[PDB]
Amino acid sequence: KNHPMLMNLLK
Amino acid sequence: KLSEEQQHIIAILLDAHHKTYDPTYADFRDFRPPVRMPLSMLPHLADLVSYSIQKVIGFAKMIPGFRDLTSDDQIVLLKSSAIEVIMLRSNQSFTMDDMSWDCGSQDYKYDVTDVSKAGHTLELIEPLIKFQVGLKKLNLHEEEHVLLMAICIVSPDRPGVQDAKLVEAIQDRLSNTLQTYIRCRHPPPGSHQLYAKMIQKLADLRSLNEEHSKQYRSLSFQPENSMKLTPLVLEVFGNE
Ligand SMILES: C=C1[C@H](O)CC(=C/C=C2\CCC[C@]3(C)/C(=C(\C)CCCC(C)(C)O)CC[C@@H]23)C[C@H]1O
């Protein structure tokens, strides 16, 4: 789905 | 008694909550201002929700075991639980004195009308307020509150979860910690069926999530309202 912001915040 | 591992788990989750929930609400000044005159409260409340998602993430990363999950599953859990944890964590500012969320000043005091001015109806707001009252009425210890948020996040039944066995295992460690905590540290009469009532709140949160999902789908479908949102909210809740 692509979640770069969520992914970024999750480290 | 609480094992050393159970005491460890509680200490970590308390500290995690303290590091991600500012009871002075100082950062609220950085949001687009509230307007109470359309959907006038949508910019302010979208920023508050966006901010809250970031904090819920910072809290989730600290849940013992959450780090052992794959990033895929971390994403699925956060995406499905974000609105539920925001509704849970918001209980801390909620007040039954006048049925509102009181975040320090009259500017940052949100009542039912403010929520309706963010694009939502009583189909969501009435059960949300009833949720908040019944949750308040439980008079949870901070320990129980932070365990409940963590258990809410690490739910194996969320759609798209791949390693449900591992998620269930992490959740069981938290649930057992909460049950033991209630037994050892929560005195009767307050402790009466307390765990069963907490799990009922997690059920109420699922219905709130479904209804929120329905109303958000409808709200965000109008490109003029989705313009009012934030990139994080769009990514987490959906981009039409
Ligand atoms: C830091 C806090 C919490 O994280 C968030 C908080 C209150 C949360 C509220 C009260 C106002 C309405 C709000 C923000 C709410 C909505 C308006 C619905 C979601 C709006 C949208 C994302 C646009 O669908 C869900 C949780 C609700 C205050 C404070 O406890």
Side-chain angles (χ1 to χ4, degrees), chain A residues 3-11, chain B residues 2-28 30-221 223-240:
Chain A
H3 305 264
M5 286 171 286
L6 182 36
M7 187 63 271
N8 181 251
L9 294 167
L10 281 173
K11 137 146 271 132
Chain B
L2 292 159
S3 77
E4 251 306 330
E5 181 204 62
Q6 286 169 158
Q7 291 175 242
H8 178 73
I9 291 178
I10 295 169
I12 279 160
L13 283 179
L14 286 174
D15 172 65
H17 183 54
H18 297 151
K19 282 166 159 43
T20 56
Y21 191 103
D22 173 9
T24 77
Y25 308 110
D27 295 328
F28 281 36
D30 296 347
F31 305 161
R32 288 173 288 173
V35 172
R36 302 163 168 107
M37 91 260 88
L39 300 203
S40 57
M41 283 296 286
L42 185 62
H44 179 74
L45 289 182
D47 282 351
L48 166 63
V49 170
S50 207
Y51 173 87
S52 293
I53 293 164
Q54 294 190 49
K55 299 303 170 179
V56 166
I57 297 162
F59 172 86
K61 290 209 300 194
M62 298 181 262
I63 298 170
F66 186 89
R67 76 166 167 200
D68 298 336
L69 296 165
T70 58
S71 75
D72 263 32
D73 275 342
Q74 296 186 183
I75 288 167
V76 168
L77 291 176
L78 277 159
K79 196 174 190 198
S80 56
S81 72
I83 197 66
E84 293 182 26
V85 192
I86 296 170
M87 284 164 181
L88 277 170
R89 75 205 308 275
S90 78
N91 196 243
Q92 183 155 177
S93 64
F94 182 78
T95 174
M96 289 187 285
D97 292 18
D98 64 352
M99 299 300 152
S100 71
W101 293 264
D102 172 4
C103 299
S105 70
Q106 295 283 122
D107 273 19
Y108 311 138
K109 191 167 175 157
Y110 318 105
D111 64 355
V112 292
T113 74
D114 294 326
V115 183
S116 70
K117 290 174 196 69
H120 290 284
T121 68
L122 273 191
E123 283 288 356
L124 182 70
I125 305 164
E126 184 263 4
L128 177 54
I129 291 295
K130 293 229 165 193
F131 172 84
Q132 295 298 331
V133 173
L135 184 48
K136 258 306 159 176
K137 289 193 167 229
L138 295 186
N139 297 122
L140 290 183
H141 292 187
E142 187 168 38
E143 291 78 353
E144 290 153 353
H145 183 69
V146 301
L147 283 161
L148 190 59
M149 290 183 297
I151 292 156
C152 179
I153 291 166
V154 190
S155 299
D157 63 324
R158 303 291 193 182
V161 161
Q162 283 291 139
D163 202 344
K165 298 283 187 167
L166 182 65
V167 177
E168 184 172 22
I170 296 159
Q171 197 193 48
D172 287 345
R173 188 144 55 90
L174 303 162
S175 291
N176 284 333
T177 299
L178 170 63
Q179 293 184 75
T180 301
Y181 179 91
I182 296 163
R183 293 232 267 225
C184 301
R185 301 282 169 91
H186 205 127
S191 52
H192 172 60
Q193 295 183 164
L194 184 55
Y195 178 74
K197 289 164 181 173
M198 295 174 75
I199 300 313
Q200 184 54 227
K201 293 300 158 229
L202 294 181
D204 296 345
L205 286 163
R206 305 298 187 96
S207 298
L208 289 168
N209 192 342
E210 302 256 34
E211 187 62 29
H212 171 256
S213 198
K214 204 166 180 166
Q215 307 199 358
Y216 175 89
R217 187 173 328 125
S218 152
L219 192 164
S220 65
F221 186 73
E224 58 267 66
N225 297 328
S226 84
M227 280 197 327
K228 298 309 189 276
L229 301 183
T230 72
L232 187 60
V233 164
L234 283 174
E235 187 187 283
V236 169
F237 294 131
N239 199 354
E240 36 191 312

